[PDB]
Amino acid sequence: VPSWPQILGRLTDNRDLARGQAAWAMDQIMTGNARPAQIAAFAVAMTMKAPTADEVGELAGVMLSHAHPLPADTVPDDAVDVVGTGGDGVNTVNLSTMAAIVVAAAGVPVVKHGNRAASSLSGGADTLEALGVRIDLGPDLVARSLAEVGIGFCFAPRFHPSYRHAAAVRREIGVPTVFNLLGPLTNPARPRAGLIGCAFADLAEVMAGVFAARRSSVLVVHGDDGLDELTTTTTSTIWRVAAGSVDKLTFDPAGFGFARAQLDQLAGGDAQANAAAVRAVLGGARGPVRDAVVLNAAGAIVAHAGLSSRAEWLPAWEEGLRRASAAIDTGAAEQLLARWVRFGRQILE
Template structure:
């Protein structure tokens, strides 16, 4: 049996053919071991983009990422809510607030994220501004989930080998398969997730990847390009919380929510967005805060539904029910968590616990 080579992999892509799982794994592993040249990495990701990435190719690359990652050994079913980024909308940190809302409702959260790349403030930037210690020892993250109900996986700390792709990503300056690998590569591999995908082309690919892995996920995107469920435009949902892929179109009116504008959801720097987080999880709902509150509750509700499926609890109905019906049943829980102050209290606990673990206590 001959060994895989760059000539074989790139030749396959140049011919417009799909890579096998093993070829995709090999190429990604070469990159993460530091043996691939920048030119080979660039040719790989652009060849995939021009051809169109398949679920098999993405799955192979995810396996290589996880094989090279510093893993988190979760001892319970947990959920992640994360997006690919790259939507260019500069909104407030919706997924971060949704994660706090979900955790405030008593659902374990292991959030994966990074600093800002294309936005003004990424999850890590905002959590840091709030006082959360984002550079906790990796071995303490499972304990943080147990003690605080939530923990944050800072991507660079868990995927150090991704540094070999850094220069290429920056120089290319266009979305590539790298944008979707992160959300799929949470080092704790939580069984449930809400994954936002700004690239319409790749959203069903992510859904197929998660379906084949047996994870309970919803892939979401709004028609105005947000990598979230939105109230500013109709949203699409690729639901794999059951044993099949089902697609839905969701408008805010279907759930009795007031339509918003992108401008109402606009954010700023880390300090500004951190203050918005405090206001929203503190129950504020006047002016633009009402619009932000709605979109946070919407994404939190969808995240709760994925966890419900992973636990087989049917709290929001059986997985045979439509995703929209189950989200509608979860919405009051999300709003109740915001209004009760539970999410705000949870953040205070998280700050304390994370700082304690960061100090090695």
């Protein structure tokens, strides 16, 4: 007999839910049957109890069942995502977006999930728009983009219309909850690999567990400086997901020859400013922004390799970094962005 008092009562007692209860809650939420107060109570109670991977897996699985899918046979078997929770409160250039472009230019199909900024000045989606990339595409056109360009972008509001009740509650309460994990977990193209950033150190393990239950090849990452990206300012924590199991590691880019950068060297601005930062890096400019992009691109490439994993860790990273650097320095990344802008401009005719 599932109900709000039962489920909320269990969470406020600090108990894990019974199997199916989180799914019931998410069903209510996604059908418009949960009142805002119920949505908010659930989000908060789940957060303070401390969600489990099974619970979050139920939320994401129900959410995905309401999402628009891409057409059959349009997503390569080895597609990767590069995306994080956001919410790190540091306001950097768009590292996941830049890395995605480089990764795609290295020959790895990228189907990227994303959204506008929530607290930062310019999110991935905003910066893409400033670059001339069409972010508003439906399933058929993202699929075509992936085939013709090597990359596609699923704009979350376009693909998850039924999440609008939850999204509004998220904005009303302001505080991060378990719902902040759902974007990265609900890419509607379901790529099987990814580099997934998590701003909340205490939730990164749960997100890893959800990918492990899917048998995805993923690195869930949290910079030890608070970034929802692999950082160059210090070490990072990586939850490596492979063969359905999770493995926690401390990662140090110094071991690959990266100098320690400062956070302000990665600082972003508005969409225009961040668009110019993308153009600078793809044009081959050296410096801390390139270093961070290359590092994160390599991470995604390593996750992709893990789909066919012989893959010793250190060699995988070495080849990842080399591939990312070549993708920029051959001009391929700059050319890929231009091809992507061109594709969007062809849609009119």
